Design a protein around this ligand. Structure first.
Ligand code: P55
Length: 328
């Protein structure tokens, strides 16, 4: 068995009105109300464009979905709606469809984002602490709302560096947390998939997002994106092993009576643990202080139960300057 150490009973105490998303009746707005201005991206699940709200003439983001199941789409909507107003949670503005094909589009707020590939390398020590902090506020909030994002990665963190505004986007994999429930482990992106997913542990929780966050954090301070560069689910676990070491992996597996798949256990092999400092270099030295290391260390743990919760992370001393600045 395995349950979240915090916010475990959020959905238990809330009525079906909150988490029974398959009972959602979508209210569609007017598509014409939003016009395309330029494509900003694409993914396996949609095509994204910078749009404009003809009425108020305000900038927006138009996400044109590719064929998806009604269940999956009512889940993203129900969740978006559930989290609206939360700290740094992207706001869902409208939901429309194409009469002819029924193709749906989710209209979100616009964020003048700067590609992480280019943005992150310019971030200062303080910028990093600041943005991670903002992102943590979003995670604690949704976790406190009985929700797991399940796909934390740079690509889903929009940042308007100019205005230092951050938003956690793409809640297309998010789920409501139910104690003991077994979820699909086919979530998140490879480079940010936690061990629980890599070893099929299905009764995972909010903590999976913290491993992802840790991956993002390590890449940022060590200036190595992505930090864990594997090519398939099995090789992802091998890269993780060559760093944290296999003893930790074994104890983890043993604690959860989990048996690895033969071929997989074959690839992993046996690896000593590599100190976090073995990743320091002239390119990232101005970013790897002990606090940054202590913090990273408490995020990237095999046992998801051992990882810091979002609330705990926000209070780590690494963020003290950000906290002191805010409380002013
Ligand atoms: C990172 C990959 N991809 C990029 C496009 N996309 C995307 N892009 C933006 N902003 C943006 C504006 C100008 C240039 C680039 C981005 N936003 N802003 C809000 C959301 C929302 N909701 C969103 N999604 C979705 C994610």
């Amino acid at each position: 068995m395995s349950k979240a150490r915090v916010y475990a009973d959020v959905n238990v105490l809330r009525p079906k009105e909150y988490w029974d998303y398959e009972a959602l009746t979508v209210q569609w707005g007017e598509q014409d109300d939003y016009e395309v201005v330029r494509k900003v991206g694409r993914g396996k699940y949609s095509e994204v464009f910078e749009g404009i709200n003809v009425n108020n003439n305000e900038k927006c983001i138009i996400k044109i979905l590719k064929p998806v199941k009604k269940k999956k789409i009512k889940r993203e909507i129900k969740i978006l709606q559930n989290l609206c107003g939360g700290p740094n949670i992207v706001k869902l503005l409208d939901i429309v469809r194409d009469q002819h094909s029924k193709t749906p589009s989710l209209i979100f707020e616009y964020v003048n984002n700067t590609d992480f590939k280019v943005l992150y390398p310019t971030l200062t020590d303080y910028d990093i602490r600041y943005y991670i902090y903002e992102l943590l506020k979003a995670l604690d909030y949704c976790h406190s709302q009985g929700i797991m994002h399940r796909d934390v990665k740079p690509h889903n963190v929009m940042i308007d560096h100019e205005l230092r505004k951050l938003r956690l986007i793409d809640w297309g994999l998010a789920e409501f947390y139910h104690p003991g429930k077994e979820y699909n482990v086919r979530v998140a992106s490879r480079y940010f998939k936690g061990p629980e997913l890599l070893v099929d542990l299905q009764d995972y929780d909010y903590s999976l997002d913290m491993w992802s966050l840790g991956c993002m954090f390590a890449g940022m301070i060590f200036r190595k994106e992505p930090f864990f560069y594997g090519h398939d689910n099995h090789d992802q676990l091998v890269k993780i092993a060559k760093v944290l070491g296999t003893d930790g992996l074994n104890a983890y597996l043993n604690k959860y009576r989990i048996e690895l798949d033969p071929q997989l256990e074959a690839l992993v092999g046996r690896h000593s643990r590599k100190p976090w400092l073995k990743f320091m270099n002239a390119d990232n030295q101005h970013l790897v202080s002990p606090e940054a290391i202590d913090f990273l260390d408490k995020l990237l743990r095999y046992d998801h139960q051992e990882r810091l919760t979002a609330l705990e992370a926000m209070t780590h001393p690494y963020f003290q300057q950000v906290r002191a600045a805010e409380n002013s």
